[PDB]
Enzyme design. Sequence first.
Site, PDB file in Angstrom:
ATOM      1  N   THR A 140     -12.009 -17.896   3.732  1.00  0.00           N
ATOM      2  CA  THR A 140     -13.212 -18.031   2.912  1.00  0.00           C
ATOM      3  C   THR A 140     -12.803 -18.173   1.450  1.00  0.00           C
ATOM      4  O   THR A 140     -13.436 -18.902   0.688  1.00  0.00           O
ATOM      5  CB  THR A 140     -14.131 -16.804   3.060  1.00  0.00           C
ATOM      6  N   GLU A 174      -7.188  -6.719  10.268  1.00  0.00           N
ATOM      7  CA  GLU A 174      -6.306  -7.879  10.291  1.00  0.00           C
ATOM      8  C   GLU A 174      -7.118  -9.157  10.469  1.00  0.00           C
ATOM      9  O   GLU A 174      -6.864 -10.161   9.806  1.00  0.00           O
ATOM     10  CB  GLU A 174      -5.277  -7.747  11.416  1.00  0.00           C
ATOM     11  N   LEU A 179       0.780  -1.237   0.000  1.00  0.00           N
ATOM     12  CA  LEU A 179       0.000   0.000   0.000  1.00  0.00           C
ATOM     13  C   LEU A 179       0.817   1.294   0.000  1.00  0.00           C
ATOM     14  O   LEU A 179       0.464   2.260  -0.685  1.00  0.00           O
ATOM     15  CB  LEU A 179      -0.926   0.005   1.214  1.00  0.00           C
ATOM     16  N   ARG A 180       1.903   1.315   0.767  1.00  0.00           N
ATOM     17  CA  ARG A 180       2.731   2.511   0.871  1.00  0.00           C
ATOM     18  C   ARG A 180       3.935   2.532  -0.061  1.00  0.00           C
ATOM     19  O   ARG A 180       4.958   3.142   0.246  1.00  0.00           O
ATOM     20  CB  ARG A 180       3.178   2.691   2.322  1.00  0.00           C
ATOM     21  N   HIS A 189       1.943 -10.961   9.398  1.00  0.00           N
ATOM     22  CA  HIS A 189       1.811 -10.087   8.237  1.00  0.00           C
ATOM     23  C   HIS A 189       3.025  -9.171   8.308  1.00  0.00           C
ATOM     24  O   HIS A 189       2.906  -7.995   8.657  1.00  0.00           O
ATOM     25  CB  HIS A 189       0.538  -9.247   8.333  1.00  0.00           C
ATOM     26  N   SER A 190       4.193  -9.716   7.984  1.00  0.00           N
ATOM     27  CA  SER A 190       5.435  -8.953   8.048  1.00  0.00           C
ATOM     28  C   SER A 190       6.374  -9.340   6.917  1.00  0.00           C
ATOM     29  O   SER A 190       6.296 -10.449   6.390  1.00  0.00           O
ATOM     30  CB  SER A 190       6.125  -9.223   9.379  1.00  0.00           C
ATOM     31  N   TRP A 191       7.276  -8.430   6.559  1.00  0.00           N
ATOM     32  CA  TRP A 191       8.217  -8.702   5.484  1.00  0.00           C
ATOM     33  C   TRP A 191       9.055  -9.953   5.721  1.00  0.00           C
ATOM     34  O   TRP A 191       9.394 -10.657   4.772  1.00  0.00           O
ATOM     35  CB  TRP A 191       9.134  -7.501   5.244  1.00  0.00           C
ATOM     36  N   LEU A 225     -10.282  -9.599   9.701  1.00  0.00           N
ATOM     37  CA  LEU A 225     -11.084  -9.805   8.506  1.00  0.00           C
ATOM     38  C   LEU A 225     -10.209 -10.333   7.370  1.00  0.00           C
ATOM     39  O   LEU A 225     -10.662 -11.117   6.539  1.00  0.00           O
ATOM     40  CB  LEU A 225     -11.753  -8.493   8.089  1.00  0.00           C
ATOM     41  N   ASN A 236     -11.483 -10.158  -1.065  1.00  0.00           N
ATOM     42  CA  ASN A 236     -12.924 -10.007  -1.278  1.00  0.00           C
ATOM     43  C   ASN A 236     -13.207  -8.513  -1.086  1.00  0.00           C
ATOM     44  O   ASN A 236     -14.079  -8.123  -0.315  1.00  0.00           O
ATOM     45  CB  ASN A 236     -13.679 -10.856  -0.249  1.00  0.00           C
ATOM     46  N   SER A 270      -0.339  -8.022   0.829  1.00  0.00           N
ATOM     47  CA  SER A 270      -1.244  -7.026   1.375  1.00  0.00           C
ATOM     48  C   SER A 270      -2.006  -6.344   0.231  1.00  0.00           C
ATOM     49  O   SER A 270      -2.782  -6.996  -0.457  1.00  0.00           O
ATOM     50  CB  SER A 270      -0.417  -6.023   2.173  1.00  0.00           C
TER      51      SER A 270
END
Length: 283
Positions: free
Chosen positions: A238, A229, A41-42, A261-263, A231, A153, A125
């Site tokens: 799902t 996180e 995202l960044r 959720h890390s590099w 979701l 989703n 991400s």
Amino acid sequence: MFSRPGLPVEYLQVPSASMGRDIKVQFQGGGPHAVYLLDGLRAQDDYNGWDINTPAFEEYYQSGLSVIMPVGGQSSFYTDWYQPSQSNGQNYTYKWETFLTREMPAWLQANKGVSPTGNAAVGLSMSGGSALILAAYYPQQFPYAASLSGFLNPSESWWPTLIGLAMNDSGGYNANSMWGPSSDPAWKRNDPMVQIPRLVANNTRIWVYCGNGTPSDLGGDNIPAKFLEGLTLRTNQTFRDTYAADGGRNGVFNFPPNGTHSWPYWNEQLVAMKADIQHVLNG
């Protein structure tokens, strides 16, 4: 950067006619087929997050695969936007799907000999869903796609709002300028979950990872970030269930309880999938 001396990493200026500007691309030649490493995202305009945080280039050096790290595209979701982000002064329209599927591959083919087909798209991400969408609509170019902690989703329930919140928090970008209001078909068009039938039909080899826990490079802290996180994991679960339900049989689903959720973990996944990519793309 992890692109230390010894690694033949080049910094290319690839013109984007659709965006009216040159797109910087970190490139490491190593074969006709390549791994497109999409940023988060960044995403910065100097270096791709993969090079900043991981030894991706070194890990794929002499792998028989070229490595492509496009630079830039903050909050772009690597998609073609409807219009310039309305709010932050963006003076052009993001056309990253056009860049990644037409302009860049054309450039790399003509100048490097990199094949526009038979490649892998890997995202994390923000770009996790992007990678699956690229493969969903461009199976020839991407017979392989990996999503690491992706939002699979985007058109469902809270996702359009959460995505809009993240984009605004990252450079003040407007999700509405990207895919319009959540009721706009663009949201479903770019929804991996909704596009599962495509992934199944094209027998796309998909590698889906998702960690768990907060805080992380995904966010964390407050209740909203925690909800996101949580979701993210549930939606990934799902996605796996739906993929299976829809006839999918060519996926690797990695949901290690201790995965984050890390590099470091996303890199671990990138390394773990190397053999998989080589076999699928060069087997």
